[PDB]
Structure 1
Amino acid sequence: GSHMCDAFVGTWKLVSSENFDDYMKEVGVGFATRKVAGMAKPNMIISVNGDVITIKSESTFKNTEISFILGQEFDEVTADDRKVKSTITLDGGVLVHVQKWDGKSTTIKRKREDDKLVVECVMKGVTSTRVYERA
């Protein structure tokens, strides 16, 4: 087993959100999409198979799935249809996901906090916090 397995693997449901509309604005999402995307309550499924981590997000609005090896950059088409270059590392027990596109950068941090998985999303000055519980 591994730290990653024990901490993150499983099925998680969104239970609260803060500032997500403002985060979406900062990453360039337009009005109609922000409105419909902001209603979504995704399930997040995290799995590990050997060195490969998979993060799936499933909702009424969009489904996404990424698989990656820690430290190894990959192509990602985000839920909001940005084509980014992503690298995910495990830093002091926090999954740190950096996305680069068009000269811009956003960082998504995923951490365990008590029984929750807390996702912090930062674009320039704007932070959104997305809190998940076990499904």
Structure 2
Amino acid sequence: HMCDAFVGTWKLVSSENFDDYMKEVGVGFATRKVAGMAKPNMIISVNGDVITIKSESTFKNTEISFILGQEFDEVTADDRKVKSTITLDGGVLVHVQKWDGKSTTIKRKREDDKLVVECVMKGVTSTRVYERA
């Protein structure tokens, strides 16, 4: 019953500062424009200790499966090859990506009937609000 409140199919309903967050990450112009137009669905499921998170949109469909606390390799939607570790910290899923001596942290939290995603790169934060689909 690890992660029960996250499981489901979620749809993006608002975004703030996502272009700036992508700039800080190093995403190029054309990817930023196309990616920023997307209204992804995030589909979260759990089977034993394995969590799966799918992101589907007109831009890209990606999928990660992982065990909490156990590093894995991830190819991001913008084609970074990163080393990822996802943990639960006080009810928040905390996803750290490392690549080329850089780091970004993506937090996912349940707040009321929403799933709130905070993406942080250095001083720049983007907030992405999802609702149940």
Same fold (TM over 0.5): yes
Structure 2 unaligned regions, length at least 5: none
* Cα 1:31–1:61 shift into 2, 3 Å: same
Q: CA deviation at 1:31?
A: 0.7
Which runs of 5 or more structure 1 residues have no equivalent in the other structure?
none
Post-superposition Cα deviations, 1:96-128, rounded to whole Å, max 9, x if no partner, equal 000000000000000000000000000000000
- Answer yes or no: is 1:54 the counterpart of 2:52: yes
Residue-pair matches, total: 133
Does 2:101 correspond to 1:103?
Answer: yes
Secondary structure of 2:33's counterpart equals: helix
Superimposed CA distance per residue, residues 11-36 of structure 1 (whole angstroms, 9 cap, x where no aligned partner):
00000000000000001111111111
Indicate the residue corresponding to 1:66 in structure 2.
Answer: 64
| Alpha-carbon distance between aligned partners in 2 of 1:71 and 1:20, rounded to the nearest angstrom | 27
Instruction: Write out per-residue CA displacement over residues 73-96 of structure 1, whole angstroms, 9 at most, x where no aligned residue.
Output: 000000100000000000000000
CA RMSD of superposed structures (Å): 0.7
Q: SS where residue 66 of structure 2 aligns?
A: strand
CA distance in 2, matches of 1:63, 1:46: 14
Once the two structures are aligned, what percentage of the paired residues are identical? 100
Secondary structure in 1 matching 2:69: coil
Q: CA deviation at 1:7?
A: 1.2
Q: Deviations over 1:20-78 (max 9, x none)?
A: 00000001111111111100000000000000000000000000000000000000000
